Amino acid sequence: RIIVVALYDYEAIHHEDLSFQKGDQMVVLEESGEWWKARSLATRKEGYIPSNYVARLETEEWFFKGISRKDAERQLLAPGNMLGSFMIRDSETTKGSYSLSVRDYDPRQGDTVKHYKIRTLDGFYISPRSTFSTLQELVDHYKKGNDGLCQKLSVPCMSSKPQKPWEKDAWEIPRESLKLEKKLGAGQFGEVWMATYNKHTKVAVKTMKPSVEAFLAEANVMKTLQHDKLVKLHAVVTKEPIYIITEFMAKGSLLDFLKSDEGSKQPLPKLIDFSAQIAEGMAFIEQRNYIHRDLRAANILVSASLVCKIADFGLARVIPIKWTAPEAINFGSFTIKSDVWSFGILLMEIVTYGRIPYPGMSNPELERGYRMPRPENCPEELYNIMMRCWKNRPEERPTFEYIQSVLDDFYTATESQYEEIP
Ligand SMILES: Fc1ccc(-c2nc3n(c2-c2ccncc2)CCS3)cc1
Ligand SMILES: [Ca+2]
Ligand SMILES: [Ca+2]
Ligand SMILES: [Cl-]
């Protein structure tokens, strides 16, 4: 007898899925991954529901599960929030513990987010003097007054409806299910379309010009590489020409967005954030021991809410020298370090708002030790990161883990990560 509650509103759009509202209790009948079979207690109907839409602490309006410090910082500084906006989350360095992230303001620094460790007793407390038995007592307390905090607690961080999962057992789909509506891009190997799946789910389809099974297997490799900074691979059409179905990114490629009007209005910390998300994705690729082979702003997608994701890596294997490292050009040796070089070039693209890497220079001719000069708006240390990425010896290039760690806390000293309260 398992009972869960709905965290968000969900309207059914399939044959056997259920419609429920925020707060509706339900009885779990079967747990089958992204989709569970359950029975509503309000409608008494048995059907399918998305797992990530229900919980059995998560039910609290001020708790956010599985999110990092940087993620909290991003979601709190997002539009729709104010001073005092806060959240309680799973600690990222203290496994099993919790942390509080609060939005603050201060001149000369702008809008910020402070983070406080929450210590579990052997109850909870931020300050040893003021202790609480439940987290709800903590939040209720600090909503009354700072009491040591950077700011008085106000309203929980604005919750965002999660991504609707792909329908069950729909990895291989019939072509008739798709209506390719608007061509977004074309190339030598195929084209890219904005399309609709079964009249309900907007997706992006990549049509591949005409081995079948081997490519299919490569796609089966890609499908298991799921990450928030990697484009979600939903479905595939098997009959030629092969269609690759992925999630739709509203603002398209990072290149086009940076060259766009809205992109030119994006400040430097936002660019740093973009490249930090890209670095995180490439770090996920790095930990899994894989290779992108073609890292550029053109191969990075941007969601509607300004989220940068890595797209279509590994497709290159089934087949850009300015983004390519010397060790990969002269000897065809492609490794993660060449991806680091490529990431340096990408960094340069992002700071220069999509500008061509070596302007005025043709592909031929680096041997004289020439590196791109630092742009006027580019920070010296960021340029230092670029230079570290552009090193002749591949083994002397930084890891994507380290690069991500540096870019994430680019404006924060290590000591200033979590505020200390006596
Ligand atoms: F399977 C895939 C389908 C489309 C793409 C794709 N390739 C490019 N863009 C998109 C894309 C566009 C819009 N939404 C999502 C992806 C934009 C510039 S080049 C990649 C993989
Ligand atoms: Ca500086
Ligand atoms: Ca500290
Ligand atoms: Cl029942």
Which residues are known catalytic residues?
294
Residue bearing the CA closest to ligand 1, atom 11: 252
Q: Is 273 exposed, middle or buried (0-12, 13-18, 19+ CB in 10 A)?
A: buried
Torsional sign, CA 201, 270, 223, 327: positive
Distance 380 CA to ligand 2 centre (A): 6
Mutate which of 301, 305, 309, 315 to test ligand 1's pocket (most atoms within 8 Å of Cβ)?
A: 301
Nearest ligand, CA 43: 4
Nearest ligand, CA 39: 4
Distance 170 CA to ligand 2 centre (A): 50
Secondary structure of residue 114 in the 3-state scheme = strand
Nearest ligand, CA 42: 4
Ligand 1 binding pocket (C-beta < 6 A) is 184-185, 192, 204-206, 244, 246, 248-249, 252-253, 301, 311-312
148 is in an annotated binding site: no
Mutate which of 246, 247, 255 to test ligand 1's pocket (most atoms within 8 Å of Cβ)?
A: 246
Give the whole-angstrom CA distance, residue 151 versus residue 60.
21
- 334 with 293: CB under 8 angstroms? yes
């406080």: which residue's tokens? 116
Please list, in sequence order, all residues whose beta carbon lies within 8 angstroms of the beta carbon of residue 373, skipping any fewer than 6 positions away: none
Secondary structure of residue 28 in the 3-state scheme = strand
190 is in an annotated binding site: yes
CA 255 to ligand 1: nearest atom: 18
- 83 with 154: CB under 8 angstroms? yes
Secondary structure of residue 308 in the 3-state scheme = strand
Give the whole-angstrom CA distance, residue 45 versus residue 35.
16
Q: According to the 3-state scheme, what is the secondary structure of 282-330?
A: HHHHHHCCCCCCCCCHHHEEECCCCCEEECCCCHHHHCCHHHCCHHHHC
Q: Please name each of the domains of the chain with its CATH number.
A: 1-59 (2.30.30.40), 60-159 (3.30.505.10), 170-252 (3.30.200.20), 253-410 (1.10.510.10)
Kindly report each contact of residues 94-99 with a partner whose C-beta sits within 8 Å and lies 24 or more positions away, as own/partner: 96/120, 98/124, 98/135, 99/69, 99/418
33 is in an annotated binding site: no
Give the whole-angstrom CA distance, residue 19 versus residue 146.
41
- 113 with 73: CB under 8 angstroms? yes
Mutate which of 184, 205, 249, 295 to test ligand 1's pocket (most atoms within 8 Å of Cβ)?
A: 184
- Experimental technique for the deposited model: X-ray
Query: Are β-strands 63-64 and 86-90 bridged in parallel, bridged antiparallel, or unpaired?
Result: parallel
Data resolution in angstroms: 2.8
Give the whole-angstrom CA distance, residue 254 versus residue 1.
48
Q: Is 267 exposed, middle or buried (0-12, 13-18, 19+ CB in 10 A)?
A: exposed
Distance 381 CA to ligand 2 centre (A): 6
185 is in an annotated binding site: yes
Distance 112 CA to ligand 3 centre (A): 15
Token pair for 64: 């956010």
Paired residues of 308 in beta bridges: 302
Q: Identify residue 30 by its one-letter amino acid code.
A: E
Distance 117 CA to ligand 3 centre (A): 10
187 is in an annotated binding site: yes
DSSP character string of 189-233: SEEEEEEEETTTEEEEEEEEP--HHHHHHHHHHHTT---TTB--E
Secondary structure of residue 416 in the 3-state scheme = helix
